[PDB]
Amino acid sequence: SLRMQHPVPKYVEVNMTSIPQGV
Amino acid sequence: SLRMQHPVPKYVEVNMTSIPQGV
Amino acid sequence: WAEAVKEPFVQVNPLKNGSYLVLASSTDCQIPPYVPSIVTVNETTSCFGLDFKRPLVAEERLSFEPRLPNLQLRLPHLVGIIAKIKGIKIEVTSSGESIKEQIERAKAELLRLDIHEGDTPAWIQQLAAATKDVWPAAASALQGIGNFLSGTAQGIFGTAFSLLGYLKPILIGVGVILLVILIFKIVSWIP
Amino acid sequence: KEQIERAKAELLRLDIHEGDTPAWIQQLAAATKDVWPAAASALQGIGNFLSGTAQGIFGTAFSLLGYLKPILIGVGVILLVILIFKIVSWIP
Amino acid sequence: LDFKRPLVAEERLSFEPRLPNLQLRLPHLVGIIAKIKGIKIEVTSSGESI
Amino acid sequence: YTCCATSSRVLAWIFLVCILLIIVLVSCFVTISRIQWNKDIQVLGPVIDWNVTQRAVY
Ligand SMILES: *[C@@H]1O[C@H](CO)[C@@H](O[C@@H]2O[C@H](CO)[C@@H](O[C@@H]3O[C@H](CO[C@H]4O[C@H](CO[C@H]5O[C@H](CO)[C@@H](O)[C@H](O)[C@@H]5O)[C@@H](O)[C@H](O[C@H]5O[C@H](CO)[C@@H](O)[C@H](O)[C@@H]5O[C@H]5O[C@H](CO)[C@@H](O)[C@H](O)[C@@H]5O)[C@@H]4O)[C@@H](O)[C@H](O[C@H]4O[C@H](CO)[C@@H](O)[C@H](O)[C@@H]4O)[C@@H]3O)[C@H](O)[C@H]2NC(C)=O)[C@H](O)[C@H]1NC(C)=O
Ligand SMILES: *[C@@H]1O[C@H](CO)[C@@H](O[C@@H]2O[C@H](CO)[C@@H](O[C@@H]3O[C@H](CO[C@H]4O[C@H](CO[C@H]5O[C@H](CO)[C@@H](O)[C@H](O)[C@@H]5O)[C@@H](O)[C@H](O[C@H]5O[C@H](CO)[C@@H](O)[C@H](O)[C@@H]5O[C@H]5O[C@H](CO)[C@@H](O)[C@H](O)[C@@H]5O)[C@@H]4O)[C@@H](O)[C@H](O[C@H]4O[C@H](CO)[C@@H](O)[C@H](O)[C@@H]4O)[C@@H]3O)[C@H](O)[C@H]2NC(C)=O)[C@H](O)[C@H]1NC(C)=O
Ligand SMILES: *[C@@H]1O[C@H](CO)[C@@H](O[C@@H]2O[C@H](CO)[C@@H](O[C@@H]3O[C@H](CO[C@H]4O[C@H](CO[C@H]5O[C@H](CO)[C@@H](O)[C@H](O)[C@@H]5O)[C@@H](O)[C@H](O[C@H]5O[C@H](CO)[C@@H](O)[C@H](O)[C@@H]5O[C@H]5O[C@H](CO)[C@@H](O)[C@H](O)[C@@H]5O)[C@@H]4O)[C@@H](O)[C@H](O[C@H]4O[C@H](CO)[C@@H](O)[C@H](O)[C@@H]4O)[C@@H]3O)[C@H](O)[C@H]2NC(C)=O)[C@H](O)[C@H]1NC(C)=O
Ligand SMILES: *[C@@H]1O[C@H](CO)[C@@H](O[C@@H]2O[C@H](CO)[C@@H](O[C@@H]3O[C@H](CO[C@H]4O[C@H](CO)[C@@H](O)[C@H](O[C@H]5O[C@H](CO)[C@@H](O)[C@H](O)[C@@H]5O)[C@@H]4O)[C@@H](O)[C@H](O[C@H]4O[C@H](CO)[C@@H](O)[C@H](O)[C@@H]4O)[C@@H]3O)[C@H](O)[C@H]2NC(C)=O)[C@H](O)[C@H]1NC(C)=O
Ligand SMILES: *[C@@H]1O[C@H](CO)[C@@H](O[C@@H]2O[C@H](CO)[C@@H](O[C@@H]3O[C@H](CO[C@H]4O[C@H](CO)[C@@H](O)[C@H](O[C@H]5O[C@H](CO)[C@@H](O)[C@H](O)[C@@H]5O)[C@@H]4O)[C@@H](O)[C@H](O[C@H]4O[C@H](CO)[C@@H](O)[C@H](O)[C@@H]4O)[C@@H]3O)[C@H](O)[C@H]2NC(C)=O)[C@H](O)[C@H]1NC(C)=O
Ligand SMILES: *[C@@H]1O[C@H](CO)[C@@H](O[C@@H]2O[C@H](CO)[C@@H](O[C@@H]3O[C@H](CO[C@H]4O[C@H](CO)[C@@H](O)[C@H](O)[C@@H]4O)[C@@H](O)[C@H](O)[C@@H]3O)[C@H](O)[C@H]2NC(C)=O)[C@H](O)[C@H]1NC(C)=O
Ligand SMILES: CCCCCCCCCCCCCCCCCCCC(=O)O[C@H](COC(=O)CCCCCCCCCCCCCC)COP(=O)(O)OCCN
Ligand SMILES: CCCCCCCCCCCCCCCCCCCC(=O)O[C@H](COC(=O)CCCCCCCCCCCCCC)COP(=O)(O)OCCN
Ligand SMILES: *[C@@H]1O[C@H](CO)[C@@H](O[C@@H]2O[C@H](CO)[C@@H](O)[C@H](O)[C@H]2NC(C)=O)[C@H](O)[C@H]1NC(C)=O
Ligand SMILES: *[C@@H]1O[C@H](CO)[C@@H](O[C@@H]2O[C@H](CO)[C@@H](O)[C@H](O)[C@H]2NC(C)=O)[C@H](O)[C@H]1NC(C)=O
């Protein structure tokens, strides 16, 4: 007997935008 | 603008057993 | 204005339209550090130890959002040391200041943080952190001579140098007494 | 008396430095102008000499000779220790 | 100024908070540190090392 | 005796040279560390422009 856990790929989309002058 | 792909964890269970003498 | 803050720094504001405003000293979920940004995700996930949810689809209307002009800003090289030794929020430049005026502003203040008999190792470690970006070879050297006075033995050399530093006035005094003997003893040999 | 003994220690410790002598001397003049106008005009002159005359080469020279002070003493001491021995090794 | 004797009151069920006690070690020369700044200045944290 | 007298002489010379070198090593360190600090103060500092795309890490 030998139980194991194999990792399987995935992903989450992340958009980013700027803030001119930090305002 | 800046589009990115962040990895997110997951897993698949995998059981294994033996074959005495290779028969 | 500049102001010293505690590390690690994390600030996350949930916006009403369903995005998040992030400013953080460290990376998570691919978000760059130090520069702020408006963040949106296509599927619920945990970032900076809290849940960033996917927003509800919206209908597009005519916008009235402002678009400010962009702006490059040059800061003094040692802005971190200037903000630290004030212990309050302090003015460091103007938007439209010259290289010359900007520098001649904390220079006298900064020069008078000189080496002392009582914290040479702690001083030498500041000089390294200040020199690292300019001359990395020198930094690594200074850092070494720092840890020698602090660490090697039980810091006995640090102790020895600290003490020989404070004795300086006594040593001169003795030194002067030796000359006054030597001169007389020499003159009282010549025929 | 109380009013004066209030920023005196603070103010005394804004002393002359090897790294901004010209910028210091120009403060001393502005501070002295109302008290002693003759001295101010002098100090202001010796200010502009270290800053302006040539390409400020004298400012540079004095700034550098200021930072070298510890090396010079060290050498000076080595000369005496030679001179004394060389002198004592002339006397019969 | 005059500290007056208060009027007798009737006892009801209380909801007053009881905070935890706390020892706090300050620097030996805290008075000289506060004096040469001439503003209200941060000197330690609750849970800082010597 | 002569060896003991010679030893005392040689010891004193090495003891003198020992100090006169330490005087030169400390003196040189103070000069160089203080100049570098002066140069550190007058270097050009960083630039900030609020551009996120510029700071992307893959
Ligand atoms: C597709 O098909 C394939 C088959 O073609 C499927 O693969 C087969 O799947 C089976 C599961 O249904 C596996 O069976 C399981 O095997 C486990 C491991 O067995 C070995 O270890 C045992 C424990 O060993 C340790 O602990 C003991 C003390 O307890 C120590 O002494 C040891 O040193 C170890 O530390 C051990 O008992 C087993 O020994 C037996 O087999 C070996 C040969 O393989 C012999 O040499 C031994 O003599 C012994 O066999 C005899 O004695 C036993 C009783 O002791 C009898 O049962 C035998 O008939 C025989 O007389 C192994 O060394 C087991 O742990 C596991 O036990 C479960 O079921 C029992 C009841 O039967 C329960 O009591 C347990 O609690 C537990 O639930 C089970 O038997 C097959 O190995 C595997 N076959 C192959 C070839 O890989 C596959 O899954 C299928 N796939 C799909 C998708 O369907
Ligand atoms: C929650 O709310 C927040 C808001 O609080 C939402 O975030 C906001 O989302 C908006 C999307 O709806 C974003 O707008 C988009 O910005 C994009 C990027 O804009 C910049 O780059 C542009 C291109 O630059 C490159 O290319 C040009 C040549 O084409 C070169 O010259 C450059 O060098 C670059 O290489 C550029 O045009 C923009 O410039 C404008 O803005 C800056 C300041 O930010 C000014 O300095 C500029 O002067 C200029 O503004 C003036 O001029 C423009 C026209 O040129 C006018 O529109 C202005 O009114 C003003 O007069 C930036 O530098 C854009 O690409 C993108 O364009 C889309 O839409 C247009 C039509 O409007 C189409 O034509 C395009 O094809 C494209 O589809 C869009 O405008 C906001 O940035 C963002 N706000 C913030 C603060 O982050 C968030 O999404 C919300 N969340 C949810 C869940 O709802
Ligand atoms: C105007 O308003 C103000 C309020 O704004 C009024 O002032 C308040 O008046 C109250 C009287 O009504 C005072 O309450 C009384 O406090 C007494 C002292 O409490 C302290 O000491 C206790 C004993 O400590 C010694 O002994 C123990 C062993 O028994 C040892 O372990 C110790 O080392 C000491 O040797 C101690 O129990 C108390 O501890 C509690 O409070 C502190 C914080 O102050 C906490 O750190 C503790 O954890 C603890 O709080 C928790 O646990 C207790 C139970 O143990 C709970 O009750 C709490 O809710 C909490 O979970 C203090 O260190 C008390 O002796 C006195 O007890 C009387 O009442 C009880 C029943 O409640 C009886 O059983 C007793 O027999 C006794 O009659 C009472 O509580 C307020 O202190 C005071 N407030 C302030 C801020 O000053 C003022 O009077 C008003 N004026 C007018 C005119 O009306
Ligand atoms: C606001 O905007 C101003 C203007 O851009 C910024 O100030 C300028 O910063 C830049 C970039 O750091 C400096 O560029 C360097 O220029 C020198 C040459 O300078 C000489 O010639 C200039 C000709 O126009 C002249 O303006 C200068 O005059 C100033 O300086 C003298 C001397 O101190 C002073 O007396 C005057 O009163 C003026 O203050 C001066 O005569 C050049 O040598 C540099 O070259 C380097 O960089 C380039 C490009 O990378 C490289 O190719 C070279 O090899 C070398 O490494 C560099 O181009 C500029 O001198 C600054 N100008 C002023 C007026 O200060 C300011 O930083 C912005 N402020 C803020 C807050 O953001
Ligand atoms: C918050 O709470 C902390 C923890 O209590 C307070 O800090 C402690 O203060 C006490 C009291 O002033 C100090 O007690 C002394 O301890 C030394 C021995 O210290 C050594 O052994 C410790 C073993 O646990 C170890 O933790 C120490 O490690 C620290 O120091 C080293 C060296 O600088 C440093 O490298 C480490 O990183 C740690 O910082 C250390 O190895 C002991 O010699 C003292 O004895 C005197 O007092 C007793 C009792 O009166 C007396 O019997 C003796 O004769 C002698 O007079 C004394 O017990 C303790 O060292 C402090 N601990 C730390 C971690 O700093 C802190 O003050 C509180 N903060 C605030 C803001 O209130
Ligand atoms: C992060 O930014 C991304 C841009 O790089 C966003 O992707 C865009 O999201 C919109 C959502 O409205 C998509 O629009 C959909 O388009 C499909 C069909 O695609 C075709 O037509 C569109 C125009 O309608 C065109 O842009 C495409 O090129 C295709 O030709 C429709 O079925 C939908 O109903 C909807 O109209 C954009 O297609 C998409 N653009 C790109 C370049 O991928 C993304 O949504 C952002 N993510 C987050 C988390 O905010
Ligand atoms: C038990 C251990 C064994 C004993 C070891 C010692 C044996 C000594 C033998 C006898 C000789 C005595 C020598 C006398 C030394 C006196 C030290 C003087 C220190 C001193 O006054 O300097 C002040 C503080 O700096 C300081 O005090 C910093 C001093 C320098 C620290 C760094 C030492 C490491 C040097 C590394 C050398 C390699 C580097 C590359 C060349 C600043 O000077 P100032 O008072 O003029 O004021 C200038 C403006 N503030
Ligand atoms: C290429 C050009 C030609 C070369 C010219 C130079 C040739 C020199 C020839 C060899 C002789 C060398 C002489 C050694 C001079 C060393 C200077 C020491 C400076 C120094 O240590 O002073 C410190 C900073 O002041 C300063 O550094 C300020 C120094 C004075 C600046 C003003 C000079 C103008 C004088 C005008 C004279 C007329 C006025 C009326 C009499 C402060 O002193 P401290 O370290 O003891 O600390 C006291 C508490 N901070
Ligand atoms: C969110 O965006 C990610 C982009 O990583 C989407 O991932 C894709 O999912 C499809 C299945 O529909 C896969 O076939 C693709 O290979 C994935 N693309 C990648 C990894 O680039 C994901 O589907 C989106 N999630 C939601 C809920 O819309
Ligand atoms: C296959 O097994 C993997 C084990 O890696 C399962 O992964 C878990 O999935 C749940 C979601 O239901 C997560 O909360 C756990 O953290 C995962 N466990 C891990 C990574 O150890 C996976 O769900 C299984 N897949 C199927 C289809 O049953």
Side-chain angles (χ1 to χ4, degrees):
Chain A
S1 173
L2 182 68
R3 207 163 173 187
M4 306 295 263
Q5 306 258 292
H6 163 80
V8 175
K10 192 171 186 170
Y11 275 110
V12 173
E13 189 169 68
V14 183
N15 295 1
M16 283 163 263
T17 63
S18 298
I19 296 154
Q21 316 207 356
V23 176
Chain B
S1 173
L2 182 68
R3 207 163 173 187
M4 306 295 263
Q5 306 258 292
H6 163 80
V8 175
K10 192 171 186 170
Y11 275 110
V12 173
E13 189 169 68
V14 183
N15 295 1
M16 283 163 263
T17 63
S18 298
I19 296 154
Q21 316 207 356
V23 176
Chain C
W1 299 91
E3 171 172 32
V5 296
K6 257 138 191 168
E7 209 160 20
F9 185 111
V10 181
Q11 169 179 320
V12 175
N13 311 337
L15 307 182
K16 270 158 202 182
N17 68 352
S19 286
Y20 303 82
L21 183 27
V22 176
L23 181 63
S25 75
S26 57
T27 309
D28 196 359
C29 308
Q30 311 297 314
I31 300 156
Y34 303 128
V35 59
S37 66
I38 306 190
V39 176
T40 313
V41 308
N42 81 327
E43 162 164 51
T44 296
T45 48
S46 192
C47 302
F48 302 102
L50 66 108
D51 275 30
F52 282 33
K53 301 179 174 169
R54 176 198 171 87
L56 188 73
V57 67
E59 313 171 350
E60 293 302 303
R61 297 276 181 284
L62 169 55
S63 186
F64 296 84
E65 186 216 0
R67 305 298 291 257
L68 268 74
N70 278 304
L71 154 81
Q72 305 194 34
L73 189 68
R74 191 174 283 280
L75 302 169
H77 174 66
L78 295 185
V79 64
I81 287 174
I82 294 160
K84 179 184 152 154
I85 71 192
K86 290 284 170 176
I88 44 158
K89 170 171 137 174
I90 197 83
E91 174 181 344
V92 296
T93 48
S94 272
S95 316
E97 187 172 46
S98 61
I99 297 280
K100 195 175 179 181
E101 280 152 35
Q102 176 168 155
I103 289 167
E104 294 276 324
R105 201 162 169 145
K107 187 181 157 176
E109 174 189 318
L110 282 172
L111 281 171
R112 280 156 188 72
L113 292 166
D114 221 35
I115 194 170
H116 199 112
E117 299 95 309
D119 64 314
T120 303
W123 187 79
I124 291 166
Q125 288 289 335
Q126 185 182 63
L127 183 60
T131 302
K132 187 147 184 165
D133 299 8
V134 176
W135 193 8
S140 70
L142 287 173
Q143 197 163 126
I145 295 155
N147 298 303
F148 167 67
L149 296 175
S150 178
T152 297
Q154 313 294 124
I156 192 176
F157 297 99
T159 295
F161 282 121
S162 180
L163 180 57
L164 288 175
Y166 275 117
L167 285 174
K168 204 187 77 173
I170 283 167
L171 291 176
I172 288 161
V174 164
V176 166
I177 292 160
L178 297 173
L179 264 167
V180 170
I181 293 163
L182 264 159
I183 289 161
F184 272 65
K185 261 285 158 187
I186 286 158
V187 166
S188 307
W189 287 332
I190 295 157
Chain D
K1 195 175 179 181
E2 280 152 35
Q3 176 168 155
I4 289 167
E5 294 276 324
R6 201 162 169 145
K8 187 181 157 176
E10 174 189 318
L11 282 172
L12 281 171
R13 280 156 188 72
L14 292 166
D15 221 35
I16 194 170
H17 199 112
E18 299 95 308
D20 64 314
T21 303
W24 187 79
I25 291 166
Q26 288 289 335
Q27 185 182 63
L28 183 60
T32 302
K33 187 147 184 165
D34 299 8
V35 176
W36 193 8
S41 70
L43 287 173
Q44 197 163 126
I46 295 155
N48 298 303
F49 167 67
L50 296 175
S51 178
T53 297
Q55 313 294 124
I57 192 176
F58 297 99
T60 295
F62 282 121
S63 180
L64 180 58
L65 288 175
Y67 275 117
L68 285 174
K69 204 187 77 173
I71 283 167
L72 291 176
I73 288 161
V75 163
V77 166
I78 292 160
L79 297 173
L80 264 167
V81 170
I82 293 163
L83 264 159
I84 289 161
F85 272 65
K86 261 285 158 187
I87 286 158
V88 166
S89 307
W90 287 332
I91 295 157
Chain E
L1 66 108
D2 275 30
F3 282 33
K4 301 179 174 169
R5 176 198 171 87
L7 188 73
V8 68
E10 313 171 350
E11 293 302 303
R12 297 276 181 284
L13 168 55
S14 186
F15 296 84
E16 186 216 0
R18 305 298 291 257
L19 268 74
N21 278 305
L22 154 81
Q23 305 194 34
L24 189 68
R25 191 174 283 280
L26 302 169
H28 174 66
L29 295 185
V30 64
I32 287 174
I33 294 160
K35 179 184 152 154
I36 71 192
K37 290 284 170 176
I39 44 158
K40 170 171 137 174
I41 196 84
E42 175 181 344
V43 296
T44 48
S45 272
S46 316
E48 187 172 46
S49 61
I50 297 280
Chain F
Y1 194 84
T2 52
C3 295
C4 189
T6 303
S7 182
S8 184
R9 267 189 159 183
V10 169
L11 183 68
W13 279 110
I14 296 298
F15 177 79
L16 179 66
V17 167
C18 167
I19 295 162
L20 285 178
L21 194 71
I22 291 157
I23 288 163
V24 165
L25 284 177
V26 170
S27 281
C28 286
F29 179 83
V30 170
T31 298
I32 299 158
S33 58
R34 284 182 83 230
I35 285 173
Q36 186 64 51
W37 179 239
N38 188 318
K39 282 165 159 45
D40 286 19
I41 290 156
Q42 319 227 42
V43 184
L44 282 204
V47 167
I48 64 177
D49 65 349
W50 279 274
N51 188 341
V52 174
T53 310
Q54 198 167 101
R55 301 219 170 187
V57 186
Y58 309 89

